[PDB]
Design a protein around this motif. Structure first.
Motif, PDB file in Angstrom:
ATOM      1  N   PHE F  28      40.325  35.054  34.707  1.00  0.00           N
ATOM      2  CA  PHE F  28      40.278  33.802  35.444  1.00  0.00           C
ATOM      3  C   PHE F  28      40.902  33.939  36.831  1.00  0.00           C
ATOM      4  O   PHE F  28      41.495  34.956  37.187  1.00  0.00           O
ATOM      5  N   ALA F  29      40.751  32.876  37.612  1.00  0.00           N
ATOM      6  CA  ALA F  29      41.140  32.862  39.013  1.00  0.00           C
ATOM      7  C   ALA F  29      42.634  32.573  39.132  1.00  0.00           C
ATOM      8  O   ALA F  29      43.401  32.697  38.174  1.00  0.00           O
ATOM      9  N   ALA F  30      43.063  32.188  40.334  1.00  0.00           N
ATOM     10  CA  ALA F  30      44.479  32.071  40.651  1.00  0.00           C
ATOM     11  C   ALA F  30      45.090  30.722  40.303  1.00  0.00           C
ATOM     12  O   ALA F  30      46.206  30.692  39.773  1.00  0.00           O
ATOM     13  N   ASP F  31      44.415  29.611  40.590  1.00  0.00           N
ATOM     14  CA  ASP F  31      45.065  28.310  40.477  1.00  0.00           C
ATOM     15  C   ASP F  31      44.524  27.471  39.329  1.00  0.00           C
ATOM     16  O   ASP F  31      45.291  27.015  38.476  1.00  0.00           O
ATOM     17  N   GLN F  70      37.572  35.620  38.844  1.00  0.00           N
ATOM     18  CA  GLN F  70      37.667  36.577  39.934  1.00  0.00           C
ATOM     19  C   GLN F  70      36.385  37.389  40.007  1.00  0.00           C
ATOM     20  O   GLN F  70      35.841  37.811  38.986  1.00  0.00           O
TER      21      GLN F  70
END
Lengths: 141, 437, 215, 141, 159, 147, 147, 56
Positions: F28-31, F70
């Protein structure tokens, strides 16, 4: 087998083919990079991924006494390039025992000139188009 | 004096066949074509085993074949029924032949098989239910299965308990163990050698005492159960003619134990579904004689248990950890000594073993999921490494230049096998405390 | 029975540790300031414990089996070395470098020892007139060490065997309700009641179906 | 039972399998984390709820004299990784009496090199992919 | 803190430390202040230094202090000219250890794998100086390099 | 005040499980990990001239779910294959499930509605896949004490 | 945690190759190299009054690709010539290819859709060329282990 | 990477000093050759046919 002692007098700087001389006391030079090596992207759950840095410029400071003959050369080179557009000159550094450097670079900004009761100092900012240090002169690497 | 195997050996299976096709005690192949070139007859035991091993989903890259001095073969029709053209493949000194017998009774078929006397060197001797084939000093003969209903049997003057110490001395870079001999003495000898040399022993048997009622029995499975070994046994109908140990190995040779994966439901091409009834299945499960049940139009192994009740995957995982740690320590200690910077016995150097061991063997397991981590109770599952200090090392150990009592601890993360449900069907549906407990 | 090594032991053993390492490296002879003797013959070194600095607040407390308390404090001891003949400045320097050699330290400063080396000061070479005829070569330096001192208390307080608590619950329906609570060393709140029955572990049996549903 | 005295000489650093040597005076190393452990969300009326941090990277500084032989190794490792893309190496720390550490990490940024009349200093920034300290070496924990 | 460690062939360790030595110079007659100054400038002349401070030497020059000129009475009749200065040099000192520790010839490791199907499985691992993990097994066959032959077609496709 | 702690166990974002097609999503992404929305409001209000009010119940409950990954994640491959699979064969639907560690769950079927914008630069990018979910009623089942 | 490293080899942006017409592009901008988008979503949903749901498969898969180049780059010349070439002769199409170093690839044909905004100032500018791509299905081929 | 190695004054022979000649300056490079031939293994079929799915 005799190990070297750090010899401050054998730290050399060659700009454009000639050797610089006439430094001020204490630090003759300083070399600093501009960006971090790797950029880390961290996910919500903890996944980590890395990116390689593709901008490797640096900066080198050069302390010269304001009576040095080498101030005139840099002042002439600076103004010449502003007109013609040719700005690059070879830059090479050596270490008595330390990390060398060998690239091309340009004069970045004009230092600050001040006049007083004693011989002053000028700190030139020489941009270097790559900033990778080298172990050439280390005795045993 | 067990020398250590390396990563490639951890996947190589060895089959102890009977033949004389090469002078050496062991050879390695990457396809059945090489064996064919070496003069193995199509349908011969080693050929079948190699085909099965290469036919799996997790097939190994190379297969090693051992040699046990062959004396004379047998083409046995005893107890069989045939209503089809019987065919036998024979290779003689790089010369390949075929034999044909038409249609009738097994004894008549065996007698008519004596016609294998043309273009021969080798000799054939019928006996009313089987034909004994014996070669001559300079001749080499390989007899292989064909379209007929018969089983090929070989005899030798040697015994496994004396051949194996020669093969291991010749070469030790293999992990799995299998044999052509099927007597109880040979099987037990193989198990006892394997358990002493840290090798996994595999075997297939057709004895009906596996099905025999649990009340009592005297099968090889039961003997191994009593002796408490780790040999992995399975009961198959076609084992004696197809050597399905190759198929069993082909489904587990390539997947590394770092995943903690088990053998419960993996399909094994070449195996024949179990035929007995549920009572027989219950009987077999008691003796640890794993079966290949055919379910929902497919085939599926069952639970892969060893002789002493333990699961196969835990044993294999422990062995993998052992070999990986050995290899990693050797590699690091050799790199350190290539430079003039050999590891000394001082408190300024000993700790590095922590990172050296954490890197190669352990961290891969933690990543892939074979090792359990976290918190429990008041205990944690994280792997731990403990190393002694120079003050604690005995002076005798200092003199001998040996380090002892390096300890490691882990937890295994097993897989799931069975599921049960409590469904309920109703025509309708029926205290209100609503206070936080 | 839970014994230890008090301050007096550590302090006295630190001098001898310095004495042996000076003798074993420089090859000179050694002498302390504690008692005076006629000046030896040949080069030699003089050892003195010039100064000692405490660190205010204790870092660890170890409780005896019976409750007595042992307290540990960090310190820093400074030793003044003086070399009197030969090439004294060379002699002192080799003492400095000795602390960087691994094998040599392990003899006298083993891991876990109650003292350690910290740093060193400048080495000054000096010439001192003698009898108005000759100049004698000398030198001086200060070596700073770490240490840890342990001392034992002079007693203990009594244990808490019985606790009595008074409780007052003010309420509007009447006067406050007074009630007490108590604790005793060996009296469990529940006695030894077995508690609720546990959830049994089913025995291990054979299953024909991988997944079975039964209504 | 003799309690340890803090021995500065037994603080060890192993990078990639070897042991670092040639530190500058005073602080040999410094370990610092990058983020706070828990993030607290506070409501209008006072309700409080917490979130667990899932980014545990840190930074470790490493002070080396500019004549140290270990400068060459780090300079070579840094440039090698920028080309191949392999950046990780094991990192392990010990304490005479203190909190250890054992993870993997990478060289983050190139320090600043300066030349003068005396042997200088370089402060490398080693990123560490986890920053949990451990009580292994504490005598009694 | 030492800057370098050199390991002997047999394992002994030689440690190198940086130093700084200060020399006090005093000139006693003539024009002493002039004499000392010429010593200072000498360290800036390249050829003169190379005689006594060759590249790679274990000591080097660092800096200089103020030069003070002094007048000292003698026998209560005359004032003598003098001067004084302090010259600071760099250096590097090497010393040799007094022994070595034993090598690690044999390593024994105990392993315990806790699992739920039964009691923990105990198993050991070992290392020996000359015992390779794989013996001398040739390993898998390599991918051969085809021999160099003539080709008629720049790019040929064959089914 | 400590008498109003809304969560006695810290909210660990890693407990939020997402299963698409029966495999657990990861990378998964950052936020933000996911976002769930509806398209239509619940009821319609028809108010008369003199104030008479009457209401209607909606029958379109479809929603949209965004999934941040990502761009170096491996799961980008599985979704990219799935798009072409459905475009040709015509089988679009696929089970979707979400675990509300300490919130609301979800369990329905969905399909890939659009593909994100792929960008390459000096930093590892990001992708926002849209998984249209057929029915988007959030479930409180993870919460205890719901009388 | 080190057990969830999503990329064991650092993502080097220079590995991303772009070929237009068979020549390798070079001279890119500062932050973003390329961006790939679609115009239409994958399927259309037609929901009835009572909740009956039916879906349709799209047949317009065209996308747009943006290509950032420094205005001093030499490749600005090749694209500028190509525009006039196609405007007169009527041959617009040209092969396009992209290499997903550690992501998704692309391989199709495309044309120059619009020309950017040329600006001159005190800094070296930038140009955003739009290369409309006929078919924009991203390919996972660079990823290993896609079963 | 190309490399350049230069001697130091201490290593220069006295005869070379007298003759005023510098020797043993060395350089090293690698050449990046081009492609000449290509071969392909095309195949035409009327249709198409182990699932390990485990990271090597």
């Amino acid at each position: 087998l005799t190990l070297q002692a750090y010899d401050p007098a054998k730290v050399l700087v060659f700009i454009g083919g000639q050797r610089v001389s006439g430094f001020a006391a204490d630090t003759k030079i300083v070399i600093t990079r501009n960006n971090d090596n790797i950029s880390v992207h961290a996910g919500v759950d903890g996944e980590i991924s890395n990116a390689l840095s593709r901008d490797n410029t640096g900066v080198m400071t050069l302390s010269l006494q304001n009576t040095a003959k080498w101030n005139g050369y840099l002042a002439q080179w600076q103004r010449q390039a502003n007109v013609t557009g040719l700005i690059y000159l070879p830059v090479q550094v050596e270490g008595s025992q330390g990390l060398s450097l060998n690239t091309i670079g340009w004069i970045q900004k004009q230092p600050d000139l001040s006049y007083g009761t004693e011989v002053g100092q000028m700190d030139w900012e020489i941009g270097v188009l790559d900033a990778w240090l080298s172990p050439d002169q280390i005795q045993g690497i | 004096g067990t020398q250590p195997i390396d990563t490639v050996g951890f996947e190589t299976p060895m089959f102890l066949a009977m033949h004389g096709n090469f002078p050496e005690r062991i050879r390695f192949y990457v396809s059945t074509a090489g064996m064919v070139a070496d003069g193995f007859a199509v349908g011969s035991p080693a050929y079948q085993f190699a085909t099965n091993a290469f036919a799996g989903n997790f097939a190994p890259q190379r297969v090693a074949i051992g040699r046990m001095s062959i004396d004379s073969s047998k083409v046995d029709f005893t107890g069989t029924t045939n209503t089809e053209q019987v065919v036998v493949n024979i290779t003689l000194n790089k010369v390949v032949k075929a034999v044909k017998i038409n249609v009738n009774t097994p004894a008549q078929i065996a007698t008519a098989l004596a016609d294998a006397v043309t273009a021969d060197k080798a000799t054939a001797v019928a006996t009313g239910t089987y034909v004994t084939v014996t070669a001559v000093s300079p001749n080499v003969v390989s007899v292989g299965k064909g379209a007929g209903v018969y089983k090929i049997v070989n005899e030798s003057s040697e015994t496994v308990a004396t051949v194996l110490p020669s093969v291991i001395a010749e070469n030790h870079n293999w992990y799995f163990l299998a044999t052509e001999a099927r007597s109880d003495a040979d099987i037990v000898a193989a198990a006892e050698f394997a358990k002493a040399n840290y090798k996994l022993h595999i075997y297939n048997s057709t004895d009906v005492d596996a099905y025999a009622p649990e009340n009592s029995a005297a099968s090889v499975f039961d003997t191994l159960k009593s002796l408490s070994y780790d040999s992995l046994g399975t009961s198959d109908a076609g084992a004696d003619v197809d050597f399905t140990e190759g198929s069993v190995i082909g489904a587990m040779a390539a997947n590394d134990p770092s995943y903690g994966d088990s053998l419960h439901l993996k399909t094994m091409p070449g195996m024949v579904p179990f035929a007995g009834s549920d009572t027989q299945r219950s009987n077999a499960w008691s003796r640890n004689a794993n079966i290949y049940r055919g379910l929902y139009g497919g085939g599926s192994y069952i639970e892969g248990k060893t002789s002493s009740g333990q699961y196969v995957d835990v044993i294999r995982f422990s062995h993998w950890v052992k070999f990986r740690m050995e290899e990693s320590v050797f590699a690091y200690m050799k790199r350190r000594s290539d430079m003039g910077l050999s590891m000394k016995m001082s408190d300024e150097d000993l700790p590095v073993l922590k990172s050296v061991l954490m890197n190669n063997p352990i961290n891969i397991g933690i990543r892939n999921g074979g090792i359990l981590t976290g918190y429990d109770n008041k205990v944690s599952y994280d792997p731990t490494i403990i190393i002694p200090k120079r003050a604690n090392i005995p002076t005798n150990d200092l003199a001998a230049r040996i380090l002892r009592d390096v300890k490691v601890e882990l937890v295994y993360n097993n897989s799931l096998h069975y599921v049960k449900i409590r469904a309920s069907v109703v025509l309708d549906r029926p205290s209100t405390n609503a206070q936080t407990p | 029975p839970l014994d230890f090594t008090n301050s007096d032991v550590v302090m006295g053993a630190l001098t001898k540790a310095v004495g042996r390492l000076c003798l074993d490296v420089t090859g000179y002879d050694v002498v302390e300031a504690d008692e005076t003797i006629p000046k030896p013959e040949g080069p030699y070194i003089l050892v003195d414990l010039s100064l000692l600095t405490p660190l205010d607040w204790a870092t660890n407390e170890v409780v005896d089996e019976d409750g007595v308390v042992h307290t540990a404090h960090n310190y820093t001891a400074s030793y003044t070395l003086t070399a009197y003949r030969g090439k004294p400045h060379w002699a002192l320097s080799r003492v400095h470098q000795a602390f960087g050699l691994p094998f040599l330290r392990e003899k006298y400063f083993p891991t876990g020892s109650p003292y350690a080396y910290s740093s060193t000061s400048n080495i000054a070479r000096m010439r001192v007139p003698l009898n108005q005829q000759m100049f004698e070569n000398r030198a001086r330096t200060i070596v700073t060490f770490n240490a840890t001192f342990v001392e034992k208390d002079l007693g203990t307080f009594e244990d808490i065997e019985h606790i009595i608590i008074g409780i007052d619950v003010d309420n509007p329906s009447g006067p406050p309700i007074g009630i007490g609570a108590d604790y005793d060393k060996g009296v469990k709140p529940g006695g030894d009641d077995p508690g609720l029955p546990p959830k049994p572990n089913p025995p291990i049996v054979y299953h024909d179906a991988i997944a079975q549903v039964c209504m």
